[PDB]
Amino acid sequence: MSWTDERVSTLKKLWLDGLSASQIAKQLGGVTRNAVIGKVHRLGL
Template identity: 75%
Template sequence: MAWTDERIEKLKELWDSGLSASQIAKELAEGVTRNAVIGKAHRLGLKSRPSPVKSDKTKPKAAPKKVVKKETSKFVTLLDLTDRMCKWPHGHPGDDDFHFCGKSSEPGMPYCAAHCAEAYQAQPPRRDRRQQQRAPIR
């Protein structure tokens, strides 16, 4: 596909009229792709336009929900848990008093700070572990 003077003029007209790159490619036909239109428009220095995909900034974003423990229940059940609550289980799942911690979890973690400290323990460096495993030769 060659960019003739006629095609370039038509591209400029369609671009200025506000058609999308896909629509312009269909108008020009014969081997012209959306990416070819975008590349040529860029090389010609045509004014850029906002992306229709990224134009959701006009919609107001919902405020983050606050985590509120239920006052009526003494325990946090599976149905009460949210992404920002500690999921550390207390008791056995078959018991009536089985529940979860429910405190605010650490960012990116499933547990609160106290339960993270209990669940994730740092390993000593490898060479230190090897020295601990070796029995002294006597």
Template identity: 60%
Template structure:
């Protein structure tokens, strides 16, 4: 059985767009929708194409990147540095030790452990239950 190579001229997956399908009107519509900061899936739905076709054309056109959503800071507001870390605080390291913003979690630690409950769940693996032979 002979398969046509993906790079062979004239080969396109069903529903795929070629560069010839991008008319000036369609490109203008893409650019307008992109500037409205609609999700790529919504732009694709409105243009009748896949979101990957949208992403590819945006990249080829060199359109400006989108603003990234601000990442929510899940760490406590108080930054705990080594000199502020007390024996009852979680000593989970946050960040790269060579970076200026490096600090420790500082949350209340679990009795007998160096970390808070959240970081104990990450640091320790629960032992597998041993099955009896009978």
């Protein structure tokens, strides 16, 4: 439910594949599409 290194790795892979924030949120669990978009920004993607 937190941005572990494992979950960040998954986010980067899926985002760089072009999956939408809601899709990634559903894959990960424990986060909304808002959380995903916020994290994408803090990662500088």
